[PDB]
């Protein structure tokens, strides 16, 4: 199987944020599987691989754009299909960054939930 940790970044501040500001670290380890696929899960996924999506603040309902960082995307081993559904794959025993996507975002102070689905892949 896989052991997955998703770690929120400390010290995030409301207001204008840097482009691609890091917001969480994804850690996927395995003793048995060489690779994994990952997709964001929300009410508004915005690309065909599910590696960028939008999430709503708990207290305000305001939306922010989140996703894998461009560096993280460039570490993908491949994009594979599971019965037709795209999953970008990555080496296990790696970390990836989840960021604020696109140009600089102005973020209202709030708590924003993020959900990912991770699946093992044998190449």
């Amino acid at each position: 199987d896989l052991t997955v940790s998703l770690i929120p970044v400390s010290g995030l501040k409301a207001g204008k944020n840097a482009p691609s500001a890091k917001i969480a670290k994804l850690v996927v380890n395995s003793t048995t599987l060489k690779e994994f696929g990952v997709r964001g899960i929300s009410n508004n996924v915005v690309d065909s691989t599910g590696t960028a999506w939008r999430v709503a603040g708990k207290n305000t309902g305001k939306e922010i754009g989140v996703g894998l960082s461009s560096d993280s995307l460039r570490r993908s081993d491949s994009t594979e299909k599971w019965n037709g559904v795209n999953w970008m794959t990555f080496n296990s025993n790696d970390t990836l960054d989840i960021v604020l996507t696109g140009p600089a975002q102005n973020v209202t102070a709030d708590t924003y939930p993020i959900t990912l689905d991770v699946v093992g892949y044998q190449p």
Binding site: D1, Y112, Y121
Partner: peptide
């Protein structure tokens, strides 16, 4: 290649932006 359906996991966390 193949996906291992039984290995699929969902993980969720809260991201907090403070004033």
């Amino acid at each position: 290649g193949s996906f291992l359906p039984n290995s699929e996991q969902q993980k969720s966390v809260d991201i907090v932006f403070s004033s």
